[PDB]
Amino acid sequence: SLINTKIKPFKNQAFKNGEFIEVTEKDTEGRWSVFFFYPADFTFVSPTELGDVADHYEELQKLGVDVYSVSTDTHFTHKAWHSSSETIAKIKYAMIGDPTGALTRNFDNMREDEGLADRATFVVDPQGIIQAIEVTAEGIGRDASDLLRKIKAAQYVAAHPGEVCPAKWKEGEATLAPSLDLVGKI
Amino acid sequence: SLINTKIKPFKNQAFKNGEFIEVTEKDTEGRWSVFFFYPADFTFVSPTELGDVADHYEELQKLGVDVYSVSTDTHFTHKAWHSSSETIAKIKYAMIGDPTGALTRNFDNMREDEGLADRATFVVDPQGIIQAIEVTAEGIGRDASDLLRKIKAAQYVAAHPGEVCPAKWKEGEATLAPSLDLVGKI
Amino acid sequence: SLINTKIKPFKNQAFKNGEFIEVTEKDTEGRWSVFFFYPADFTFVSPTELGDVADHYEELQKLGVDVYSVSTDTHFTHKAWHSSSETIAKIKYAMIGDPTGALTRNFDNMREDEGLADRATFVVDPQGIIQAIEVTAEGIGRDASDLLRKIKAAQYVAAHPGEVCPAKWKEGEATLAPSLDLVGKI
Amino acid sequence: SLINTKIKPFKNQAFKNGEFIEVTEKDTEGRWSVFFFYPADFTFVSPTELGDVADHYEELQKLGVDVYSVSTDTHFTHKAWHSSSETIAKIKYAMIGDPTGALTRNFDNMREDEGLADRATFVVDPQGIIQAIEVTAEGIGRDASDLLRKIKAAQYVAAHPGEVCPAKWKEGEATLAPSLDLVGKI
Amino acid sequence: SLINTKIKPFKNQAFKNGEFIEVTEKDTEGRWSVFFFYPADFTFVSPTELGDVADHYEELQKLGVDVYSVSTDTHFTHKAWHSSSETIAKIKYAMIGDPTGALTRNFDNMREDEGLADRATFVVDPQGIIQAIEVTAEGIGRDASDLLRKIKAAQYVAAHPGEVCPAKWKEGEATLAPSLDLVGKI
Amino acid sequence: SLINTKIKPFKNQAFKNGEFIEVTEKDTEGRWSVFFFYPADFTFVSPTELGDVADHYEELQKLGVDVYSVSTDTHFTHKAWHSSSETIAKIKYAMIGDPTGALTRNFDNMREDEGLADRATFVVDPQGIIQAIEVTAEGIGRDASDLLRKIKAAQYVAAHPGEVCPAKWKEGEATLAPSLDLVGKI
Amino acid sequence: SLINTKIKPFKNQAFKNGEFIEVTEKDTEGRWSVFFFYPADFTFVSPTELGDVADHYEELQKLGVDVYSVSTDTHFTHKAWHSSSETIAKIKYAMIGDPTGALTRNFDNMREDEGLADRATFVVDPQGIIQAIEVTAEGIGRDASDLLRKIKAAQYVAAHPGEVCPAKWKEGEATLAPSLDLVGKI
Amino acid sequence: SLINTKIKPFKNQAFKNGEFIEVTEKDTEGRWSVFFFYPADFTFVSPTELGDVADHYEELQKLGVDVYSVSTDTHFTHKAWHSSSETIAKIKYAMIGDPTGALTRNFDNMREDEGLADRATFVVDPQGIIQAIEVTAEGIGRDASDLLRKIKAAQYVAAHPGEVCPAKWKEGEATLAPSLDLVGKI
Amino acid sequence: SLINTKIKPFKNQAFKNGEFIEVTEKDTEGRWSVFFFYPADFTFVSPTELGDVADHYEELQKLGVDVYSVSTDTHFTHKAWHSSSETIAKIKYAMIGDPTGALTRNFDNMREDEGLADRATFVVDPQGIIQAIEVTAEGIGRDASDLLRKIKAAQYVAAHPGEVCPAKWKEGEATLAPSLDLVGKI
Amino acid sequence: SLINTKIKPFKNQAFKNGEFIEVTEKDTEGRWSVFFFYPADFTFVSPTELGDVADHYEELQKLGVDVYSVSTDTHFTHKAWHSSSETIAKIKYAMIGDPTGALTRNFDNMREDEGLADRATFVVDPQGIIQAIEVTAEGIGRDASDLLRKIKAAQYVAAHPGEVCPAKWKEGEATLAPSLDLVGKI
The strand pair at F32-37 and F65-71 is best described as parallel
User: Using CA atoms, how far apart are residues A148 and H167, in angstroms rounded to an integer?
Assistant: 56
CB J56 within 8 A of CB J65: no
User: Using CA atoms, how far apart are residues C1 and J150, in angstroms rounded to an integer?
Assistant: 75
User: Using CA atoms, how far apart are residues D57 and D63, in angstroms rounded to an integer?
Assistant: 10
How far does the CA of residue A23 sit from the closest CA of chain C (Å)?
A: 15
Residue F57's closest CA among F8, F95, F14, F105? F95
CB A93 within 8 A of CB A67: yes
CA E135-E140-E142 angle, to 5 degrees, is 60
The strand pair at G116-117 and G119-124 is best described as unpaired
Q: Is C79 on the interface with B (CB under 8 A)?
A: yes
Measured between beta carbons, which residues in chain D are less than 8 angstroms from residue A19? 180
CB I63 within 8 A of CB I152: yes
CB C77 within 8 A of CB C173: no
CA F170-F171-F173 angle, to 5 degrees, is 75
Task: Count CB neighbours of B21 within 10 A.
Answer: 14
Q: Say whether B183 and C80 touch across the interface (CB within 8 A).
A: yes
Measured between beta carbons, which residues in chain G are less than 8 angstroms from residue H161? none
User: Using CA atoms, how far apart are residues G39 and G41, in angstroms rounded to an integer?
Assistant: 7
Q: Is F159 on the interface with D (CB under 8 A)?
A: no
Q: Is C72 on the interface with A (CB under 8 A)?
A: yes
Q: Each residue of D61-78: b (16+ CB within 10 Å) or e?
A: eeeebbbbbbbbbbbbbb
Q: Is I99 on the interface with F (CB under 8 A)?
A: yes
* Secondary structure (3-state) at E115: coil
SS (H, E, C) chain F: CCCCCECCCCEEEEEECCEEEEEEHHHHCCCEEEEEECCCCCCCHHHHHHHHHHHCHHHHHHCCEEEEEEECCCHHHHHHHHCCCHHHHCCCCEEEECCCCHHHHHCCCEECCCCEECEEEEEECCCCEEEEEEEECCCECCCHHHHHHHHHHHHHHHHCCCCEECCCCCCCCCCECCCCCCCCCC
SS (H, E, C) I10-67: CEEEEEECCEEEEEEHHHHCCCEEEEEECCCCCCCHHHHHHHHHHHHHHHHHHCCEEE
User: Using CA atoms, how far apart are residues B121 and B38, in angstroms rounded to an integer?
Assistant: 9
CB H109 within 8 A of CB H8: no
User: Using CA atoms, how far apart are residues H10 and E111, in angstroms rounded to an integer?
Assistant: 64
Length of chain F: 186
Q: Do chains F and I touch (3 or more CB pairs under 8 A)?
A: yes
User: Using CA atoms, how far apart are residues G56 and A75, in angstroms rounded to an integer?
Assistant: 73
User: Using CA atoms, how far apart are residues H9 and H25, in angstroms rounded to an integer?
Assistant: 5
User: In a 10 Å sphere around its CB, with 0-12 CB exposed, 13-18 middle and 19+ buried, how is residue C58 labelled?
Assistant: exposed
Task: Check residue E175 and report its DSSP letter.
Answer: -
CB C71 within 8 A of CB C101: no
Measured between beta carbons, which residues in chain D are less than 8 angstroms from residue A20? 180
H helices of chain H, where? 45-55, 57-62, 75-84, 86-89, 102-106, 144-158
User: Using CA atoms, how far apart are residues C138 and D3, in angstroms rounded to an integer?
Assistant: 9
The strand pair at J32-37 and J65-71 is best described as parallel
Q: What does each C-alpha distance from D184 to A80, C42, F156 come to in angstroms?
A: 6, 4, 77
Q: What does each C-alpha distance from H68 to C7, H33, H36, H103 come to in angstroms?
A: 74, 8, 6, 12
Q: Is D180 on the interface with A (CB under 8 A)?
A: yes
Task: Check residue B8 and report its DSSP letter.
Answer: P
CA atoms lying within 13 Å on the CB side of residue E138: 15
Query: Could you give the angle at which helices E144-159 and E45-54 cross, rounded to 10 degrees?
Result: 50
Q: Going by C-beta distance under 8 Å and a sequence separation of 6 or more, which residues neighbour residue A147?
A: A34, A53, A56, A121, A123, A134
CA atoms lying within 13 Å on the CB side of residue J111: 21
User: Using CA atoms, how far apart are residues E54 and E67, in angstroms rounded to an integer?
Assistant: 9
CB E184 within 8 A of CB F85: yes
CB E122 within 8 A of CB E4: no
Q: Do chains G and I touch (3 or more CB pairs under 8 A)?
A: no
Q: Is A72 on the interface with C (CB under 8 A)?
A: yes
Q: What does each C-alpha distance from G17 to A180, G90, G121, I80, J54 come to in angstroms?
A: 12, 9, 22, 98, 71
The strand pair at A65-71 and A32-37 is best described as parallel
Q: Say whether H138 and G47 touch across the interface (CB within 8 A).
A: no
G partners (3+ CB pairs within 8 A) are A, B, H, J
H helices of chain G, where? 45-54, 57-62, 75-84, 86-89, 102-106, 144-159
CA E82-E87-E90 angle, to 5 degrees, is 65
Q: Is I131 on the interface with J (CB under 8 A)?
A: yes
User: In a 10 Å sphere around its CB, with 0-12 CB exposed, 13-18 middle and 19+ buried, how is residue D81 labelled?
Assistant: buried
How far does the CA of residue I83 sit from the closest CA of chain E (Å)?
A: 10
Q: CA end-to-end span of chain H, whole Å?
A: 28
User: To what resolution in angstroms was this structure determined?
Assistant: 2.2
Of the partner residues B80, B101, B113, the one whose CB lies closest to the CB of residue G84: B80
Pairs of CB atoms within 8 A across G/H:
178
CB F93 within 8 A of CB F184: no
CB I29 within 8 A of CB I67: no
Pairs of CB atoms within 8 A across A/B:
180
Q: Is B89 on the interface with A (CB under 8 A)?
A: no
Query: Could you give the angle at which helices C45-55 and C144-159 cross, rounded to 10 degrees?
Result: 50
CB J46 within 8 A of CB J40: yes
Phi/psi for E101 (5° steps) reads 80, -5
CB J1 within 8 A of CB J68: no
Torsion-angle region of A169 (φ positive above 0: left; ψ -120 to 50: alpha; else: beta): beta
Q: Going by C-beta distance under 8 Å and a sequence separation of 6 or more, which residues neighbour residue D18?
A: F180
Phi/psi for B45 (5° steps) reads -65, -45
CB G146 within 8 A of CB G140: no
Task: Report the run of H or E that residue C123 belongs to, with start and end.
Answer: strand C119-124
Of the partner residues F43, F76, F81, the one whose CB lies closest to the CB of residue I40: F76
The strand pair at E110-111 and J110-111 is best described as unpaired
How far does the CA of residue B114 sit from the closest CA of chain A (Å)?
A: 12
Task: Count CB neighbours of A170 within 10 A.
Answer: 11
CB E1 within 8 A of CB E133: yes
* Secondary structure (3-state) at J90: helix
Q: Is J89 on the interface with I (CB under 8 A)?
A: no
Task: Count CB neighbours of H148 within 10 A.
Answer: 18
CA atoms lying within 13 Å on the CB side of residue G160: 17
Q: Say whether C83 and B184 touch across the interface (CB within 8 A).
A: yes
User: Using CA atoms, how far apart are residues J121 and J140, in angstroms rounded to an integer?
Assistant: 13
Q: Do chains J and G touch (3 or more CB pairs under 8 A)?
A: yes
Chain A residue whose CA is closest to B169: A141
H helices of H56-143, where? 57-62, 75-84, 86-89, 102-106
I partners (3+ CB pairs within 8 A) are E, F, H, J
Measured between beta carbons, which residues in chain A are less than 8 angstroms from residue B85? 184-186
Task: Report the run of H or E that residue C121 belongs to, with start and end.
Answer: strand C119-124
User: In a 10 Å sphere around its CB, with 0-12 CB exposed, 13-18 middle and 19+ buried, how is residue F147 labelled?
Assistant: buried
CB J165 within 8 A of CB I136: no
Q: Is D186 on the interface with A (CB under 8 A)?
A: no
CA atoms lying within 13 Å on the CB side of residue C64: 11
Query: Could you give the angle at which helices D144-159 and C144-159 cross, rounded to 10 degrees?
Result: 150
Task: Check residue J89 and report its DSSP letter.
Answer: G
List beta partners, residue I158: none
Q: Going by C-beta distance under 8 Å and a sequence separation of 6 or more, which residues neighbour residue A96?
A: A12, A13, A14, A23, A68, A69, A70, A71, A75, A103
User: Using CA atoms, how far apart are residues F116 and F101, in angstroms rounded to an integer?
Assistant: 8
CB G72 within 8 A of CB G104: yes
Amino acid letter, G96: I
Q: CA F142 from chain center: how many Å?
A: 11
Q: Is the alpha carbon torsion for D171, D172, D177, D182 positive or negative?
A: negative
* Secondary structure (3-state) at G147: helix
Query: Could you give the angle at which helices A45-54 and A144-159 cross, rounded to 10 degrees?
Result: 40
How far does the CA of residue C184 sit from the closest CA of chain E (Å)?
A: 6
Task: Check residue H9 and report its DSSP letter.
Answer: P
Q: Is H52 on the interface with G (CB under 8 A)?
A: yes
* Segments of chain G assigned E as strands: 11-16, 19-24, 32-37, 65-71, 94-97, 110-111, 116-117, 119-124, 130-136
Q: Is G161 on the interface with J (CB under 8 A)?
A: no
Q: Is I76 on the interface with E (CB under 8 A)?
A: yes
Amino acid letter, G95: M
Q: Is B186 on the interface with C (CB under 8 A)?
A: no
Q: What does each C-alpha distance from G10 to A61, G22, G102, G107 come to in angstroms?
A: 45, 10, 8, 11
Q: Is C131 on the interface with D (CB under 8 A)?
A: yes
User: Using CA atoms, how far apart are residues A149 and A155, in angstroms rounded to an integer?
Assistant: 10
Q: CA F120 from chain center: how many Å?
A: 8
List beta partners, residue B12: B23
Amino acid letter, B144: A
User: Using CA atoms, how far apart are residues E127 and E104, in angstroms rounded to an integer?
Assistant: 20
List beta partners, residue B119: B136
List beta partners, residue A67: A34
How far does the CA of residue J159 sit from the closest CA of chain I (Å)?
A: 12
Q: Is H84 on the interface with I (CB under 8 A)?
A: no
H helices of H9-143, where? 45-55, 57-62, 75-84, 86-89, 102-106
Q: Say whether B83 and H184 touch across the interface (CB within 8 A).
A: yes
Q: Say whether J167 and I141 touch across the interface (CB within 8 A).
A: yes
Interface test with A, best of C41, C73, C118 (most A CBs within 10 A): C73
Q: Each residue of H19-30: b (16+ CB within 10 Å) or e?
A: ebeebebebbee
Interface test with B, best of G74, G98, G114 (most B CBs within 10 A): G74
Q: Do chains C and F touch (3 or more CB pairs under 8 A)?
A: no
Chain A residue whose CA is closest to B161: A139
Q: Say whether I184 and H18 touch across the interface (CB within 8 A).
A: no
Residue G146's closest CA among F144, H176, H136? H136
Sketch out chain B's domains with CATH numbers.
1-186 (3.40.30.10)
Q: Going by C-beta distance under 8 Å and a sequence separation of 6 or more, which residues neighbour residue D86?
A: none
Interface test with G, best of A176, A180, A182, A185 (most G CBs within 10 A): A180
